[PDB]
Design a protein around this ligand. Sequence first.
Ligand code: HEC
Ligand code: HEM
Ligand code: HEM
Ligand code: HEM
Ligand code: HEM
Lengths: 99, 379, 109, 54, 59, 78, 51, 47, 50, 66, 238
Amino acid sequence: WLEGIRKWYYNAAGFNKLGLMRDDTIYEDDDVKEAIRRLPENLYNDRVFRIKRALDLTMRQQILPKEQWTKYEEDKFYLEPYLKEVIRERKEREEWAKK
Amino acid sequence: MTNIRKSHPLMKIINNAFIDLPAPSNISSWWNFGSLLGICLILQILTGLFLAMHYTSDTTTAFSSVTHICRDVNYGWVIRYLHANGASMFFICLFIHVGRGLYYGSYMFLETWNIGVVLLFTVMATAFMGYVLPWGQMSFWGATVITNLLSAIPYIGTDLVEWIWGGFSVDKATLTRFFAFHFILPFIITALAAVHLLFLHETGSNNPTGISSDMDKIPFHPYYTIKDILGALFMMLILLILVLFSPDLLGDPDNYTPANPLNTPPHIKPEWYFLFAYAILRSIPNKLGGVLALVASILILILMPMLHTSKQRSMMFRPLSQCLFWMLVADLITLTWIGGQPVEHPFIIIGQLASILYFLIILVLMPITSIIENNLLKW
Amino acid sequence: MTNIRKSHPLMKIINNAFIDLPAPSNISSWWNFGSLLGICLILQILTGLFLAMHYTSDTTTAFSSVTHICRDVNYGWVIRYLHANGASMFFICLFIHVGRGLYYGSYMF
Amino acid sequence: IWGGFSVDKATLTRFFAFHFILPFIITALAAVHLLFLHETGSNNPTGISSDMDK
Amino acid sequence: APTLTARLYSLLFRRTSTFALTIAVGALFFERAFDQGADAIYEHINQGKLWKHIKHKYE
Amino acid sequence: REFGHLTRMRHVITYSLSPFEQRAFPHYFTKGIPNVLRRTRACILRVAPPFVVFYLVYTWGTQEFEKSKRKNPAAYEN
Amino acid sequence: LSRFLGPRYRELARNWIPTASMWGAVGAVGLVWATDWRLILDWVPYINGKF
Amino acid sequence: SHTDIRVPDFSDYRRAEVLDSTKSSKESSDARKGFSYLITATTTVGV
Amino acid sequence: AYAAKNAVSQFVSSMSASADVLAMSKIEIKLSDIPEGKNMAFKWRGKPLF
Amino acid sequence: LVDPLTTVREQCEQIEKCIKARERLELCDQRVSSRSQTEEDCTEELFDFLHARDHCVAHKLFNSLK
Amino acid sequence: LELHAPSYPWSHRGLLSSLDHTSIRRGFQVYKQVCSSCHSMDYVAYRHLVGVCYTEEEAKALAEEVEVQDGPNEDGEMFMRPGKLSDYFPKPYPNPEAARAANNGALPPDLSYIVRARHGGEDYVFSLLTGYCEPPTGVSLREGLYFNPYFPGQAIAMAPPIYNEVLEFDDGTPATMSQVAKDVCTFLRWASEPEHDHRKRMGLKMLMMMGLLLPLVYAMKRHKWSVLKSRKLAYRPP
Ligand code: HEC
Ligand code: HEM
Ligand code: HEM
Ligand code: HEM
Ligand code: HEM
């Protein structure tokens, strides 16, 4: 039901077409930058290569072959725990600042 | 020894600015419109300086001076129509540029975006004052209405309006003032462009994907230089087609009758670029409300960064936001069309609906849709 | 945190130019004529802009326009004579600066 | 330069346009001037390097 | 055998000085060829509708 | 932001052939045309519909305005 | 916004409020004087000697 | 692992003259450079 | 502050309406010339007058 | 001297669009003339006829002109 | 209500076509002999005719035909002189109000930019020149006003000015009303845009030159970018 429309949006958004994953496309604010610098090196190198390949594909206005597109289930939110921890720590610092 | 390009101070600045500036490899043709704006500004400055060598700003001689430029001056017609159509090309490229900024989330570069809004205001003022200079019927009466719009401001109001007019109504003082201001403003625009480029270089350039491209950067000199030259050639193709094949396509014919303060032209409309704001103004009946709406139409670009609720910078991977963005573009086209058309029964309601939809799309629909998208992507 | 004067780019340039610029402690009053020239240039620009709001470049109306500025524009005479005499002050400061450069070997730059 | 056989209306209009535009070029050249000056600092009256006493 | 492009590169494209002269000399002749060619086309399209064509009658 | 220290990247290998030893327009039509059609197919679903609405409104607005200008016979009837 | 809705921020606000009020007074006087706004100056003693 | 990697094939893009792997590029170097620089030269003439 | 007020005021009033323009504030219309039933129009304040 | 515009104009009256418009113009002219005191005019119907006529006239008039 | 002018197949309408200077020559004759007693071409001078529709000797003769006031002679008296090339076309009426008083208070416009100023261009002018029709029923034109379905308001203040055989073209062309209208409209088109011929010539030149350059610049751009276009990438984690 909801998973149907979410899967629709996943296909509608093209980051699977470029071989990217959802966390690769997040906007790099300060929290995102801290989360990135907290990534383990394997995850970090995978991220940079994915983004480089995507930028290359967009440069030539081409898309990755259909079999190599990311799968909605296979997509893994590598950055989510680190980003959540960064956000939680920032929230605590703000809360201490409040009073 | 050292490389002169790196070492020498002025050459160092030029090198970092244009030669060896790290640029993303994937920026598309939409990014060429900034360099196209620069070329348009330079062409306008040269063209207007050469026009001013033959233009006298007195009301008795202004229209006769433009006729002298068109007829007697060697290749004067080429220059005059290059200027007139270059203004339209400037505004086309500005609209496309701001559209690119909205679509690809380039507004996150806060200072660059704000300096850009300031530049848009300056360019619009420059064009509005410049259109008065030929002193045709349309020039005089458009100036009358647009300056009379300022009377809606409470208190200062009439005082400010007459101060700008230099008198009770638009007259010789206003024409000369507009000539002087139209001369000086492009140079301020040129300086603000340098400020704009500085702020952008602080943060680099955004890519169509919207993801940081520090991993994939290419030197500007060996690539985007020839790309921008190709874009400039295409722009010259379009502009020269306008200048030569259809010289009076984007201009109202009623600017060729000398201005008569005692007779209103059959229709009073601003130039095509101002038409959407003219329609927005006409939509609201109250004068002060119309002026505030006209100001807000442009100032909403200031609020655009604050209204960004999506987790993805660009709309490339936001299909619903893409649909809303193209609805906004169609709405702007509709507003232009309404502004061209007279204020009668069919067009009044269309204009009101278009204005409401424009503000709604920018303020409420786009942020809510972005939030829905984030929820869809399991954020 | 960082000081905005030293970190914001436009403010950084302005600071390095005329706030934290290391200047010699013994420069004389002959080293004020450069800033005087800059002030003169800004004054000439402002005054000429206000003059041009009433100046017409046609031969039939040039002299009449200058007379109109002198007699009819409110405080027009102040602006006009400010321009005319500011040009002379401009060249006074230019000559003095050239002389300072010759005398103190500033031409080595 | 005259725009004609002698000084006349054309020359007057050209001189107005040039007299308008040139001061801004003067400002740009002055900016370059100050840049080059700041590259090497400012000479003091004694003519000796004043880095100790800045 | 050296191709025509190969001969050009050695003879006049290898050194920018020769490369620049070829452009400059080429620019001179191209202008005289393009302009004459352009006018002939414009004259042919507008044959009998221009003063040059109809000048003989009134002179 | 100089070129040397932009970011940190590891174990990425790029092979790039010279401009002179490769064709400027490899498969410009053979592969370009199918790629354009693919790009058009994806984009037209989103870009076009908003503009289609404008064409309807433009047509309806022009028709309605012309209808208003036309005389009402009932007004001059009786 | 919710970040700044805190008691310490209220304390800072109270601390700077008199200063803000004084700056507002400076601005008001500046405006009235620069424009020579007669509406306000009319009441002002010995400034009413003008106009 | 340096030996493991091998340069990918670029034949689809390689110009016909330098497609052959048994022919030294020096013979066709002048031809190819002449082609490109001719394009540039005619561009500059028009400009 | 006093000097700056003086200078800026002088420049802004230079942008204000000039004496010649203020001279034409009022007009003298010849009623006798105007024929009955005709809306003879004039330029008053640089604006059309009916 | 027969003016070509006169001849070309006649040719529209044969055309059906001119035929229908002319009949509408004639009828509306009758109604206005019949009514003693009416504000109605034939201008709107006249334009329909002239618009149809002139459009036909434009295509062929210049051929006769020389 | 308004009636738009039809798109007549003008010779100059072609993207690369221009004005027939034979028609321009006949058009000036219509203006000089008919639309000159009213309407004043201030911005067109006899010297402009030198390279368009009459030769220099012919232009000098035409200029000499009319008489023009000259500057103050000794004793400061204005005097008439034979005329010269530098003189612009004479204005029939001394002042606009004199022109109004001589035409039922209807200022005759300046033919100079009449084409570029009125929507529809030469098509409109032709339509209103050859459009004067009988007033429809219920219309009561004020005396001194004439019925023209193309003039805004359909109440023009000039009587049909172009009737068959109104003038005699020196070229021998039969002076029909439509022929006269076409000639005068071509002349007005030239007057509004004297650069028309050179404009089309420069259009042809820029078209051909851009057709040359854009492919060449594009080839250069693709040649420079091909390094990236063909670039291959590989990820080799240890
Ligand atoms: C004598 C007086 C004449 C003659 C012989 C012609 N015209 Fe012109 N005209 C005249 C007057 C006094 C007016 C006023 C009517 C009005 O108020 O519109 C006009 C009108 C025109 C117009 C339209 C003006 C406008 O609406 O902008 C045009 C385009 C025009 N007249 C041109 C024209 C041409 C091409 C003629 C013969 C070939 C011609 N006129 C005859 C005065 C007079
Ligand atoms: C005379 C007016 C202007 C000039 C000369 C100008 C120039 C430029 C140039 C050269 C760039 C470099 C990138 C590119 O070219 O795409 C740029 C980028 C940018 N400009 Fe401006 N611009 C102008 C107006 C504006 C306006 C009106 C806005 C916003 C309302 C704006 C906001 C931006 C933004 C957001 C970018 C970022 C582009 C990116 O992310 O790569 N500019 N501008
Ligand atoms: C850089 C941005 C500029 C824009 C957008 C601009 C825009 C315009 C426009 C729209 C007109 C009216 C054209 C017409 O209807 O005839 C005009 C006229 C004019 N402009 Fe500019 N202009 C610019 C720069 C300049 C500069 C730097 C000068 C310097 C002198 C200048 C001098 C003139 C003059 C003299 C005219 C009157 C001549 C004429 O209208 O043909 N312009 N300008
Ligand atoms: C409008 C004209 C000018 C402006 C606005 C200008 C501006 C300045 C300024 C602001 C300074 C720094 C202040 C100072 O050193 O006193 C300076 C210094 C200097 N200027 Fe000028 N200047 C102008 C004309 C000239 C001329 C005509 C020359 C030489 C022919 C010149 C050569 C120099 C030199 C050599 C210095 C270095 C002085 C030192 O280091 O002690 N400038 N200029
Ligand atoms: C370094 C800057 C400048 C210098 C040295 C300079 C010099 C002069 C001089 C010597 C005069 C003659 C005044 C007289 O005879 O009374 C003059 C007149 C004038 N200048 Fe400038 N000028 C400068 C900048 C400008 C600028 C920036 C403008 C306009 C934006 C301008 C516009 C005028 C005008 C309108 C006049 C006529 C004033 C009159 O007739 O008395 N000038 N200028």
